[model samples]
Target: RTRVLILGVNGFIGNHLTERLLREDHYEVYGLDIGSDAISRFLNHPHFHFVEGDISIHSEWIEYHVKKCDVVLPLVAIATPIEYTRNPLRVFELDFEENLRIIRYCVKYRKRIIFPSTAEVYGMCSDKYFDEDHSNLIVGPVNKPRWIYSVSKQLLDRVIWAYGEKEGLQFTLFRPFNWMGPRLDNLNAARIGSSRAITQLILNLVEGSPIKLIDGGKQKRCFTDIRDGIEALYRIIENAGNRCDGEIINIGNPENEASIEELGEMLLASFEKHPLRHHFPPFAGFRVVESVEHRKPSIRNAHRCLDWEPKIDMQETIDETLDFFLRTVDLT
Candidate 1:
């Protein structure tokens, strides 16, 4: 059984990945997070060990585990745009500085590291579809604080690559393009405008507020279902013949590309068909706000290497996300 150490194991991807690994019954999962609410179901599982701790504060614990575990997955990050813009320096500190420390630990311990690189790194690129290797990483002027998050991830990606070339570090960088499903983000986060697009939209309808469509909601996003995306991730972990080693793969459903406006419409339609539709007031509709851009991933490498491609469609993903929010999200 592979011994895996997942940092930020209570996060959406972390929780789901833990669930999948635990279900396999062959991987022993050790995880550290500041909260345990997301993985409450796995708290008692024999193979799943959980610890509540901050990544920034738990230096000794993180290093010890990096030395012990076969693979290190650092899943922690300040991924939301609001947080990035509001506290750009903080984003750099945790996302770059803290994660860089963890990466160094992985290098020191000679552990295989699977790092999370964001699609935002390809900001403002001119490519029709963002290719993992070919597309230029183009962010806005330095004046735009939002680009800090993208630059941080991009710089880290470069650093990891440099480490791999010089230090022979075994690594796979996976860039996620809006993987959505249950536990994606909480209702509270959504209410505060820090949640992902879908959850925020759900909150808007639930509160009977106009869905805020930033920049006329013209930007396109390829929404990959969490399950499908996780499958690709699992394959990367398996690393059969080290297929994903030293490579960056885009795990997303290119077929599910939809404009933000289209996404809002689809979610509103899904909510209309929902069983609990009566519980919420009629949709207050969409309002315009200022902001954002397009991301469509080309998964050619993921297909050729991992034999993986996302199978879930947009509507199904939308329906599934809405179901999770309705059933579990606090209406308060």
Candidate 2:
């Protein structure tokens, strides 16, 4: 079996990919994580190996695992928006500094990598689809602090691409618009350090809290289903040759684009259709404060490069996520 090492495998995308891969054959999967919440089922799986450690600092164990695996998924990062500006130094340290070393190690070992880049790298979009080659990145100033995540990921994405160009690293770089689903950053942000807007919105709608929309929830995004995102990613891994290697694929559904305000409204409508909606009546409507205005990705590269596009409809995806959050054991 081919050994595949997943850094931050217990994370939102990593966990889903890990579980999805486990359903298939011929892959020996190993997970390196700082948390062990949703992945307990895989811990005892014969083909699964779980390691608990912080990747922000160097460790011999991480190095050993990196060397052994054919594909190195350097997923460890501070992805939670809530934690982005708080302790801002730690954000950069984990998001860039730590991951930088992992990339270096991958180049040294000549390993293939599929990196989960972000649509935030496009910064602010102006009614234009984010082409991997053409979109202009409009990032906020450093002092604003809230926009640091976008800045950091943008820099990191470019760095990885640089390695692919200069060092001949076989890599697939994907920018996911808004990949959200069940078990995505369900843990407390103070504890696990990440949460998606979809997950948080559903949690708030279900738990009877006001769904706070950042700046009227006006920020637009292409909310691709996590399954769709992973399907694309898995395909990238399988067909790394002509399909995905050295390409910046946008793993998103352009048709699913909606403003954050629209997303909140959609969540409310979806939850009203859900069985558990009665217990959680709509609380305060939406209190829009301040947040970025726009983010929409262009999936032309994805369509041309990969033999795939998002199959799930946006409403179905929204309903599916609500159902999962409502039916599953509450994370709170």
Candidate 3:
């Protein structure tokens, strides 16, 4: 049986990926994370095993679990602008050192490494759709600490590429655009503002309350359904070979791009109700001042390489996300 090990399997993507792998029933899945209540719920699964520790300081923890698996998927990283901006220095440390340790361990054991990168590495490109080849543009301020996360990931990307070229380590990089869906915690008080914003809007609508926005809700982004994103990962791993070795693929729905205002409007429309009034939050203290009015990825490379394309679109993605929040609200 094919065995796969996932690092940082506690976050939104990690949880969804773990469920997908388990459903396949073809691969044994082992997860390693810092041990959160969210992940602890799955520890009882017969095929699921958990390792509680840090990936950077506790390399041996991962080394032991990875030895039994044929492939290592490292999804550990400080994602989300708010999450990374909180402590730029620590974000840099985790993104660079922790991820580096995982890569090195995978190389040492001759295990295939599937590293999930982010579109933030694109910096601030003016292009409407960023492809795997568009990694040269730098749009963020150099002095601002917020950009440290992107710089750290970019540095590691080069490190992985160089290590692969020199040491022949099998590595596949995925630059996934915005992904969100079910299994997300709505009651986690520590959840970031962005996550809270989405949940708040859904709950307010269910309670017949008005929806609010930030900056009059003019910011834009491409949102990919977590289901489609997980499916793409499975396809890539199953077809791993020379074609995917040392390759970088962008995973996203090219047709799902939307502005914050547009998405909020779409969400409200999906519920067949209109907000009584929309209020904009204070944007004066924002770290990353420039709003990404339009940001998306070109998935042609992914389709060509992995024979995979996003099966879900933005409308369905929003509906599904709303359904999840509503279910959680009703349970309370």
**Top-scoring candidate (TM-score):** 1
Model 3 CA lDDT for position 100:
88
Sequence-dependent TM-score of model 3:
0.83
- Per-model RMSD to reference: 2.4, 2.5, 5.0
What's the CA RMSD of model 3 in angstroms?
Answer: 5.0
Candidate 1 ranges beyond 4 A from true positions: 187-195
The regions of model 2 sitting more than 4 angstroms off are 187-195
Pairs with steric clashes in candidate 1: none
List the candidates' TM-scores in order.
Answer: 0.95, 0.91, 0.83
lDDT by residue for model 1 over 142-230, one digit each (tens)? Answer: 88787898999999999999999999999999988878888775633311111277767888888789998888988888888998988
* Model 2 / residue 171 / CA error / Å: 1.2
lDDT to native, each model? 0.85, 0.76, 0.70
Clash totals for all candidate models:
0, 2, 0
lDDT tens per residue, model 2, 203-256: 677667788877666667778888888888788777645677788888777889
Model 3: per-residue lDDT, tens digit, 1-332?
Answer: 57888776766666777777778778777777676565666688888877786776786767887777888887666655665667777676777787788888888888889887767778777777887785465757776767776778788888999989999888889887766687664333222112344555566666665555565666667777878887888777776455777889888777887766676677777655322222322122212223445667888878877888788878888888876655554333
Q: Candidate 2 at 81: error in angstroms?
A: 2.6
The worst-scoring run of ten residues by lDDT in candidate 2 lies at 186-195
